[PDB]
Amino acid sequence: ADPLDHLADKLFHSMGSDGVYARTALYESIVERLAALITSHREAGTEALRFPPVMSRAQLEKSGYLKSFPNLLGCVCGLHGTEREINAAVSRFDAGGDWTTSLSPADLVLSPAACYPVYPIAASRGPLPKGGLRFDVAADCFRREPSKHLDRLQSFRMREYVCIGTPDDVSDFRERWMVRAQAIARDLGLTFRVDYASDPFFGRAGKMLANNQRDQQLKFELLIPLRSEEQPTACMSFNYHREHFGTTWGIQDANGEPAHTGCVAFGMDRLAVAMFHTHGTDLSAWPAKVRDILGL
Amino acid sequence: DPLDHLADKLFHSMGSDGVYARTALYESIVERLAALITSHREAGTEALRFPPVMSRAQLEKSGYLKSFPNLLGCVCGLHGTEREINAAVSRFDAGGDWTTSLSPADLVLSPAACYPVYPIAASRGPLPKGGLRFDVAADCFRREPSKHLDRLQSFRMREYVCIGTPDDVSDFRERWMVRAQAIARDLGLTFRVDYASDPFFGRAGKMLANNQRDQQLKFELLIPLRSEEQPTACMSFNYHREHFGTTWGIQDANGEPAHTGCVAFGMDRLAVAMFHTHGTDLSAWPAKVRDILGL
Amino acid sequence: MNATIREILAKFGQLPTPVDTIADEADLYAAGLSSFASVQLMLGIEEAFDIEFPDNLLNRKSFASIKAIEDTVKL
Amino acid sequence: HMNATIREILAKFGQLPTPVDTIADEADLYAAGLSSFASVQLMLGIEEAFDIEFPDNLLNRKSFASIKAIEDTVKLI
Ligand SMILES: NCC(=O)NS(=O)(=O)OC[C@H]1O[C@@H](n2cnc3c(N)ncnc32)[C@H](O)[C@@H]1O
Ligand SMILES: NCC(=O)NS(=O)(=O)OC[C@H]1O[C@@H](n2cnc3c(N)ncnc32)[C@H](O)[C@@H]1O
Ligand SMILES: [Cl-]
Ligand SMILES: [Cl-]
Ligand SMILES: [Zn+2]
Asked: B94: domain range?
């Protein structure tokens, strides 16, 4: 059985849906300390934005999310009909039928990653300054992948630092963060390795994108053994998008070329689970240095 | 609108009415307000934090479709096979409509923070004497687009919930009506309290709202933001009688169907109210308010 | 009137006792008529007869007893 | 003939600025303006026009760097 399963009792309560859990005070206190630790490592000159759990469907479509991960997307739908129509849908439900046939799409989707809304915001400001722009973003994200594994959730918190600038601005940013993130993971007493990887692009066309991404080392992951040392869990990622989003959003660097972008992403729930898997569910029994690092 | 001038310092557009990016200034005040509310939490209260989605089955069972069907956001996705999904995507590329391939998941966006707590309470058996008390929070959703900064589609809710006998809940209600007003006063806010009704849907919704108002089951703390004649409800107290106790089979300590009640804080409305009242320059906020918030 | 009301109250009222047991003057709420049943009942009165209550008479009081309902109909 | 088919597809899906007539067999398509997303459509276009399907070993940047690379790959399949 899954080594993580036994953690559930102290960390979560069931909400009647795989990958969607209520969080206990114990669990939340650690998510919060991890967030503050990440904040304490923020670089100077970084603009912090917090996003809600939904974003514009038009913006997500434009970002190319449908060509890449259509199977993971959560769209918002509602009952947009007349009073008569809505009442009938409710009455069908009372009579053993399906009220959801009266749903139609809203102009919103659940956010699949925290960075997406930042690109049009940056674009709206005109050409980037020399050195580019850096953002500290967070959102509750959603991916339609039900699982009973505690490290694979449908609704989860993502924290990211995003750099938008020249190729050199962005690649140096990513290298700074790859070193810094590993130092944080060591301070937290976590066991990990860093390997290159690829996003789960969908379909035949996706195997090619995944191959190129891996081959060009556009994505590193910090991997922590949770379920097994043979199938470790990615708890952070370090991503390089080249000019893909700079081109999509018409972002120009200080030299007048389409900007490059990259981000370092922290899976807050995976990291919290990793802390509890690694040091157990009694905080007073955590190593003193770990407690100190987290301000406990 | 009187609140519009606040947008520059608090929010960035996300291309959708009622859905905004929050600035660091705005979030720092949301956080201080959350810490203040926590500092007034009563003894014996269990804290739970919910995600922005919940089980569609739980919400159906809660009766939400008989009350506010027009306000609900359901999660839908592309559930087909690779060819089916590719077809939908192809239609998007072609200029057609991919959304026709969407089908409902087993999830909805949570309309209020308290709903997931009732089945959790019920799963523990009969209530102890004194009942149970919960501190819950969630990002909530309501399908009502608006450009007004105090009417959002996605917003944070914080609630203290009491589940117990009628006397337990009545005692809890009296206490939180007093405490909510004391919090608003410490925050330097101007308000009145009045009885009100939830926006129940349709003609049946008219009777429901009437009954709720007549029976005084809902109190709101109302703050003049855009006007004094149209104040904004920033806190509420909701008495549900035995509605949720019956729905979920929750038994109080005497073996009767439990009553429930809750005090609700609209975190985004309170934050907007603070900035409207005190301005966007924190150093100039009244000294007592700064002290109260730990600034 | 009582002819058609005892059918509806049995249909949408969702009470423990049958509609042939209520005393046409007793309190329907103490009997077991919940809030949401009561509105399904109200709606049943607007469909069995061709009339919609004003929001004034649209309340708990108009549906307290079976005689309370009947009286309201004439007015 | 195989050469010219590939060329028509490169104008079909390729999304290139300069015409396929203005591109040599052994020439850098990515430098020419073949984007990532485009190269994937191109690959799907090749698959449709020749009714074949690539192995995952050749599902990469290398196989589509040039018309010649494309031709050699399709032939070797
Ligand atoms: N914008 C940059 C980015 O998206 N990057 S990434 O797509 O790689 O995911 C970012 C991080 O979110 C965490 N994460 C991802 N999926 C899940 C899941 N289903 N359950 C829990 N945590 C998850 C995980 O730690 C991962 O490293
Ligand atoms: N269970 C308890 C409850 O739900 N109660 S209540 O339904 O009345 O909303 C609770 C609180 O959420 C806030 N709120 C409600 N709707 C909005 C909105 N559209 N925009 C911003 N804040 C809002 C408001 O402060 C309100 O008092
Ligand atoms: Cl996570
Ligand atoms: Cl709010
Ligand atoms: Zn990102």
From this structure: 1-295
